[PDB]
């Protein structure tokens, strides 16, 4: 799916925030402003950058000279929200764009804060346009290399990859001929089923998906592990290439953790919980795809398939 | 081990931070201050928050009425802006569940900032008689001990790894062994079982290879357990010479390999050696995994007295 | 149905109670005052605040200076009735609105009691209107999230859901083709019939409802239980989608629970027993709907239909 | 087990509360006072009522002529309104059926507060000879024992769960088996049957999974029974090994899974561990479920000597 | 040994270079200036920066406001010579091993390809300038933090050390740690130590040198079976000086490959060794030893069990 970007700004900076959102939207991006219709339960602008700021891939903060409530000074509120945004989104996923006359620094912890002139027609300013273009270019290169972070879904994907997918690929590639359930195959494909959402238990969902698709079970012996690899094979749609299937079970762990940490004494899901679940699924899928594409033995033999 | 607490302050808050650190050490804690010898690579007092402030269990912010003025700090044009930005960065790095704040009277900070109470105390030379600061530190200690005793959880990679490992392997193994009228593993009958989970000392070696050589050195033999909670049998390791009356089972978690390689991929630049931040992150991940696993084990009647977490 | 809200007040707070009731009615709420025409058998304001106050979704208390009979002091009466209110409605279903200057603590066990100026034309006080708006917003938010309590109907709904409805949906979704009684279906819908009232035995009522509507019986084999799931299918109005029916049986248990609990030395039903019956039915329906809507395998496949 | 009684009082009524508690243990009761070491998370004596006072079978208050004055309490501006509000909260948590009250001479509380008798007793240093207080405690004990002996029930979730489970499964099973001239289950003839209901010790494990592993551990075989009281046959479990002359049937109620899940969703915040209030609530739910099931079994001729409730 | 640092400057700016060399020398560093007695065969400074500049761990370049005019030696303008030697220095030493120090008024940038070029004021007594002193201190701190983490580059000795480590030393340590008891040549040991013999120089064939070292020290061969390789690990054991802790020995053979490569690259029709060849050999040996030690110290199974010992 498209990359999610959060834009934080004060009440006076909605014009700049909307212009930046539109410009990013024309660049095939998903953009949410701090007062988006998603963040209605949030009371003020401070707690939306505390609760649902890290739930986005990147973030942009806009500073306004005029903005210089909770605190006793607008300057204090601006610097506090800047610090909170930078801490929540780190130094690799955070970007800043202060207007001309704003007296914030320009090299805060490795994050540049370019200055743009305050005008009325924003389809005229070369400086603001080129700064937004630089931000877009930086975001586009990070997504293509595969910048990683200690997110739980990223670690889950890395562990799942190295301990199951690479082992399966090595075991299948180390066979002079592929003999699965007594049937010979001249090639194989490894399909990883990623659930559309974390609204159901992963184990039962995987079991019922296998039952509905009528997928049998295979056992693969590997020298890279002390116990065999257990998989699922089609046996009906697989004529010449072995069609193997698997739904990751670590997703059960992330679902249980999200349920424990989010769910208070209520049954319904808050907006923050839903955003966190979608973010975890997106990072898991993206990290798994990036890990797959960077190995010669798993590149064209493993495909990530939606449920 | 002990609970690690990070204390952030300004250049003039060293007295307050040192007193708080000493009083916390009196309460069986492991306190680190922003100016400690661990954080030497951090050039200023702001990168020590962006880097290692989130690597501690809890954090305390001390604010004094000396940085709430208009002066120069070589980073922000005003020291007040610098201290407010530092407070915001601290809160963002540690969140609303692991951040505590102490301010002296006269500071312009709020008192109900995003669910974080910031009590005021009267500054004095002798802090052993300061009732206000002493009682606020007492409340901080009480809250920290309460959140450690329940099991307050947070989406850290190690916490999620421990939860997944527990739910998918440990509970399933305990249910499989408890659903047997007699425990017959490798053709030997046992009247009881104990499931030892071996946590590595560190993450400086590959977890799979380290577990394999640990099993070889201790001479532990593999077993297979059939379960109704999974589509394929659970594979474990049994001792078979020291397990005469009670079946002794061993397992080194493999998700620790995933977290180890993730940390290697993230923190390690083009250098062989490990930075202090990487070591702190690995220690925090390992400790959090062990603590979360212990908390999950102790909150289930089927695993409370049958699974023991043992250091390598 | 509309949310039921109870207003507790003394004899001199009647104008405030009527104003709040009118505002909540304009805010799409059902409001009953302590001296409503339904609370006629109740003698004083204390026994009606003990017996039928917990039978409403939420509650509002109003304090007045003039009240500062059963006790020897009116102030003692007011604080005692406030305590009884809090004990009946807990900390999540209780709200309070004291008039200006009232000396009640403002953080009584986590419940705020805002102060409003005592005027004559109640369509003028900004403070009272914004406090009522805040109360309405809080109530509306705690209904969209599914806030849950320890009511027997809620527990019955949770158990019924997780033990029957989720199992049935998982069993039906785990089928490569839907084959019920030898008829192939391309989809299915599960209809749960909730009785209009608890004035009849649930088992016999379900049987007669089925035999009027002419619904057959089916058996479904599931891996989530030790014995097969038994349902009811239409087979006449179901052409391509399997239309299933079921009346919950625990409703009989709760029905006879109220039957034995309400000291039935007579034949007719008192007002408290009746209002409790609709409260339990409403809570059961709401909890079941919230549980259904939060599972991907039951969301669009289960429908709660009135009898 | 024993009957739990909660005693609520002020900070100066500790002597009377201790005396009454001691007499109730002399009368075979399990009494907890608001200042006990179990109610530590409750910071004051007001949160002790709103949280755990409704988790006890019965409750008793002692009121003294020390807090019916005008003083400071840091919560209410006067101690008189504080004690009256505390009385009201206690009554609201416990109602008119499970609450008892005691006042000494000089207390301004009424004596017929909504059907709750509040007798007056004389304060003295040597309380073992106070005829009024001793006879009021005796009357309270008599009333409590009368309530326990009779099937006194309230709208608790566990009580409704037990009523539904009984009247929908146990009575139907007993009627189906008693309507058979001979008991033939799985092709084996028996001259009599016994139905054992397995109540788990605690709610720390999934009830369905725990029942399944218990059945596997005891090698228990499933049976199907046809009945005219329900549209589809009843499914039960039989031993087939120890049932030589009388058929033994085992069944762990599944609605206990419902109450366990409801308690987990309600009481558990973002923490792995269990609070004291949650543990007390789970114990109370299990006790009321077992008590209601036993009372319903004993209040029917077709189930009194044929169904037995046994712990796990 | 002490870290090697090269300072390049012009003839008219040798006083700043000498002061920087002395200041680094007081900081436990080995410093050579382009006009040192080692680089006599080199004709000019340009040839020195092309041949031996990369043979040092780090490099420092000094620019002054006296060779920036439109004067007249290899190029036409002394401006061109300065910018050319700066480019050659930065290319030879890369961006992780190059440092610059221009004087006040110099025209060079301050963020040239990631290499900061601080400006200092030119005086007569350099034990007075706070700016130059703090710039040299910053350079020293950067070099110190680089040497302690283990910054690595694609040098042949670094790659040789990495391959040798991960293919022999780690495998040997895992094989020995995966033994319930250590049984080498029929003798039981309760502990082991792995000694890696690094030759003092590359002036002799590594294979024959290792063989004669083993013969002189009377070290016997052992065979170790491992699950991390398809064929066993062959080592050497003392068997006389090892009573309770087994003492194992090995001289790396990849040093033979690096010695052969250096001999093939540098010898061009003579028997004696050029100073550049000697510097390259010392650099390769030092980087091999340092990389091996760094790799050893960052593994729990090899930290206290493997020691790097001089011949
Ligand atoms: N179909 C299939 N999928 C596989 C297999 N092995 C791994 N996976 C997938 O890879 C994920 C990560 O496995 P891990 O690193 O070994 O980390 C595992 C491991 O440490 C431990 N564990 C799980 N199963 C076993 C086992 O059978 N034996 C042992 N000794 N440990 C196990 O629990 C961790 C989390 O397990 P999961 O939730 O299951 O998540 C697993 C699972 O989704 C396999 O043989 N077949
Ligand atoms: N049409 C239909 N509805 C179903 C079926 N299974 C469950 N339900 C519905 O789900 C409700 C909750 O079931 P529970 O949690 O298992 O809790 C149940 C269970 O523990 C026990 N029970 C009931 N029937 C059986 C049975 O056939 N076998 C066994 N072993 N236990 C049963 O009595 C508890 C309360 O039973 P209920 O009042 O009936 O309420 C039941 C019933 O209305 C089914 O196969 N068909
Ligand atoms: Ca979920
Ligand atoms: Ca590592
Ligand atoms: Ca040579």
Which of D266, D267, D270 comes nearest A260 by C-beta?
Answer: D270
CA-CA distance, C48 to D130, in Å (whole number)?
37
Please provide the DSSP assignment of E117-177 as one string: --EE---S-SSS-HHHHHHHHHHHHHHHHHHHHTB----HHHHHHHHHIIIIIHHHHHHHH
**Residue A107, token pair as written in the block:** 């090299």
Q: What number of residues does chain E have?
A: 311
Any chain A CB within 8 A of the CB of C170? yes
Which of B76, B114, B262 comes nearest A47 by C-beta?
Answer: B114
Tell me the resolution in Å.
Answer: 2.9
Residue D232 marked ligand-binding: yes
Instruction: Decide if E150 and B273 are in contact by the 8 Å CB cutoff.
Output: yes
Helix pair A250-262, A202-213: axis angle to 10 deg:
140
A229 CB less than 6 Å from ligand 1? yes
What strand order describes the sheet that includes D4-8? D30-33, D4-8, D58-63, D99-104, D120-121
Instruction: Decide if E291 and B272 are in contact by the 8 Å CB cutoff.
Output: yes
**Residue B141, token pair as written in the block:** 């200690």
In chain C, which among 5-44 make CB contacts under 8 A with chain D?
none
DSSP state of C298: T
The residue numbers preceding gaps of C to N over 2.5 A in chain E are 72
Helix pair B276-298, B157-165: axis angle to 10 deg:
30
Coil, strand, or helix at residue C257?
helix
Termini Cα distance of chain A: 15
What are the phi and psi torsion angles at E134 (to 5°)?
Answer: -75, -30
Any chain A CB within 8 A of the CB of C159? no
Please provide the DSSP assignment of chain B as one string: -PEEEEEE--TT-HHHHHHHHHHHHTTSEEEEETTSGGG-S--STTHHHHTTGGGSSEEEEEE-TTSSSS---SSSSSHHHHHHHHHHHHHHHHTTTSEEEEEETT----SEETTEE--EE---S-TTS-HHHHHHHHHHHHHHHHHHHHTB----HHHHHHHHHIIIIIHHHHHHHHT-SSEEETTEEESEEEEEEEEPS-SSS-HHHHHHHHHHHHT-EEEEE--SSSSSPEEEEE-SSS-SSEEEEEE--SHHHHHHHHHHHHH--SBSSPPHHHHHHHHHHHHHHHHHHHHHHHT-TTTTTTEEEEE-
Distances A8 to A83, A114, A122, A173, E281 between C-alpha atoms, Å: 12, 16, 18, 49, 58
CB E283 within 8 A of CB E55: yes
Max Cα-Cα span within chain D: 79
Ligand 2 binding site (Cβ under 6 Å of any ligand atom): C 159-160, 163-164, 227, 229-230, 246, 248-250, 253; D 164-165, 168-169, 234-236, 251, 253-255, 258
Q: Which residues of chain D make contact with C162, given a CB cutoff of 8 A?
A: 257-258, 261
**Residue C64, token pair as written in the block:** 């007045």
CA-CA distance, D245 to D249, in Å (whole number)?
13
CA-CA distance, B123 to B139, in Å (whole number)?
18
Q: Which of C47, C74, C158 to mutate to test the interface with D (most CBs of D within 10 A)?
A: C158
Please provide the DSSP assignment of chain A as one string: -PEEEEEE--GGGHHHHHHHHHHHHTTSEEEEETT-TT--S--SHHHHHHHSSTTSSEEEEEE-TT----SS-HHHHHHHHHHHHHHHHTTTSEEEEEETT----SEETTEE--EE---S-SSS-HHHHHHHHHHHHHHHHHHHHT-----HHHHHHHHHIIIIIHHHHHHHHT-SSEEETTEEESEEEEEEEE-S-SSS-HHHHHHHHHHHHT-EEEEE--TTSSSPEEEEE-SSS-SSEEEEEE--SHHHHHHHHHHHHH--SBSSPPHHHHHHHHHHHHHHHHHHHHHHHT-TTTTTTEEEEE-
By C-alpha distance, which of B76, B116, B71, B112 is closest to B94? B116
Q: Which residues of chain D make contact with C70, given a CB cutoff of 8 A?
A: 110, 113
Residues 6 or more apart in contact with residue B252 via CB below 8 angstroms:
B197, B198, B199, B200, B207, B210, B211, B214, B312
Provide the β-strand partners of residue D236.
D223
CB E288 within 8 A of CB E154: no
Instruction: Decide if D254 and C159 are in contact by the 8 Å CB cutoff.
Output: yes
**Residue D116, token pair as written in the block:** 């709750």
Distances C154 to C151, C160, C250, D156, D263 between C-alpha atoms, Å: 5, 10, 11, 11, 11
Nearest CA to ligand 1 atom 33: B165
CB C55 within 8 A of CB C275: yes
CA-nearest residue to D204 within chain B is B300
Q: Is the dihedral of CA D98, D103, D107, D110 positive or negative?
A: positive
> For strand B192-199 and strand B246-251, is the pairing parallel, antiparallel, or unpaired?
parallel
Please provide the DSSP assignment of D161-174 as one string: HHHHHIIIIIHHHH
Instruction: Decide if B161 and A159 are in contact by the 8 Å CB cutoff.
Output: yes
CA-CA distance, A179 to A181, in Å (whole number)?
7
DSSP state of E11: G
Ligand 3 being an ion, which residues bring their Cβ within 5 A of it? A 198, 255
Termini Cα distance of chain C: 15
Task: Tell how far the Cα of A230 is from the centroid of ligand 1, in angstroms.
Answer: 10
Q: Which of B76, B94, B163, B207 to mutate to test the interface with A (most CBs of A within 10 A)?
A: B163
The best mutation among D168, D173, D215, D232 to test binding of ligand 2, ranked by most ligand atoms within 8 Å of the C-beta, falls on: D168
E-B interface (Cβ pairs under 8 Å ≥ 3):
yes
Burial of D102 (0-12, 13-18, 19+ CB in 10 A): buried
Residue D288 marked ligand-binding: no
Residue A246 marked ligand-binding: yes
Scan for tokens 């250098």, then name that residue. B271
Instruction: Decide if B179 and D217 are in contact by the 8 Å CB cutoff.
Output: yes
Residues 6 or more apart in contact with residue A180 via CB below 8 angstroms:
A218, A220, A233, A242
D-E interface (Cβ pairs under 8 Å ≥ 3):
no
Q: Which ligand is nearest to the CA of A274?
A: 3
Burial of A194 (0-12, 13-18, 19+ CB in 10 A): middle
Q: Is the dihedral of CA D86, D89, D94, D100 positive or negative?
A: positive
Burial of C168 (0-12, 13-18, 19+ CB in 10 A): buried
Nearest CA to ligand 1 atom 19: B254
CB A245 within 8 A of CB A164: no
B234 CB less than 6 Å from ligand 1? yes
CA-nearest residue to C92 within chain A is A265
Residues 6 or more apart in contact with residue A266 via CB below 8 angstroms:
C142, C145, C146, C147, C148, D265
Q: Which ligand is nearest to the CA of B282?
A: 4
CB E286 within 8 A of CB E1: yes
Any chain D CB within 8 A of the CB of C144? no
- Determine what percent of chain C falls in helix, strand and coil, rounding each to the nearest 5: 40, 20, 40
Instruction: Pick the atom of ligand 1 nearest to A162's CA.
Output: 15
Scan for tokens 């790659």, then name that residue. E159
CB D160 within 8 A of CB C152: yes
Task: Tell how far the Cα of B234 is from the centroid of ligand 1, in angstroms.
Answer: 9
By C-alpha distance, which of E309, E283, E260 is closest to E32? E283
CA-CA distance, A205 to B168, in Å (whole number)?
15
Any chain B CB within 8 A of the CB of E145? yes
Q: Which ligand is nearest to the CA of E209?
A: 5
Which of A79, A84, A230 comes nearest B81 by C-beta?
Answer: A79
Instruction: Pick the atom of ligand 2 nearest to C162's CA.
Output: 15
Please give, rounded to a whole number of angstroms, the shortest distance from the CA of D293 to a CA of chain C. Answer: 13
Instruction: Pick the atom of ligand 1 nearest to A226's CA.
Output: 30
Alpha helices (H) in C66-117, listed in sequence order? 74-89
CB A150 within 8 A of CB B281: yes
Task: Tell how far the Cα of E253 is from the centroid of ligand 1, in angstroms.
Answer: 41
Q: Which of D268, D273, D274, D278 to mutate to test the interface with A (most CBs of A within 10 A)?
A: D268
Coil, strand, or helix at residue D32?
strand
Any chain B CB within 8 A of the CB of E301? yes
Any chain C CB within 8 A of the CB of D160? yes
């Amino acid at each position: 799916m498209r990359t999610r970007i959060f834009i934080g700004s004060s009440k006076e900076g909605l014009k700049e925030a909307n212009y930046v959102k539109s410009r990013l939207e024309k660049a095939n991006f998903e953009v949410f402003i701090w007062n988006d219709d998603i963040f209605k339960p949030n009371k003020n602008t401070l707690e939306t950058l505390l609760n649902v700021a890290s739930l986005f891939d990147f973030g942009i903060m806009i500073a306004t000279k005029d903005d210089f409530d909770i605190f006793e000074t607008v300057r204090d509120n601006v610097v506090f929200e800047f610090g909170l945004f930078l801490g929540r989104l780190g130094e690799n996923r955070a970007f800043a764009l202060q207007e001309n006359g704003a007296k914030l620094p320009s090299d805060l912890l490795g994050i540049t804060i370019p200055k743009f002139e305050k005008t009325d027609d924003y389809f005229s300013n070369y400086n603001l346009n080129t700064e937004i273009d630089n931000i877009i270019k930086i975001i586009n290169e990070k997504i293509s290399l595969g910048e990683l972070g200690l997110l739980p879904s990223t670690v889950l994907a890395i562990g799942y990859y190295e301990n199951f997918v690479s082992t399966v690929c090595d075991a299948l590639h180390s066979l002079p001929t592929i003999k699965l359930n007594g049937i010979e195959y001249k090639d194989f494909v490894f399909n990883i089923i990623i659930p559309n959402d974390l609204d159901a238990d992963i184990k039962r969902r995987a079991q019922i998906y296998f039952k509905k698709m009528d997928i049998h079970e295979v056992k693969i012996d590997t020298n890279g592990r002390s116990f065999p690899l257990y998989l699922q094979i089609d046996e009906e749609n697989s004529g010449d290439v072995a069609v193997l299937y698997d739904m990751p079970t670590t997703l059960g762990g992330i679902d249980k953790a999200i349920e424990m940490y989010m769910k208070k004494g209520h049954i319904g899901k808050t907006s923050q919980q839903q955003l966190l679940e979608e973010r975890e699924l997106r990072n898991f899928k993206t990290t798994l795809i990036n890990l797959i594409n960077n190995n010669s033995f798993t590149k064209t033999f493993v495909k990530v398939i939606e449920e």
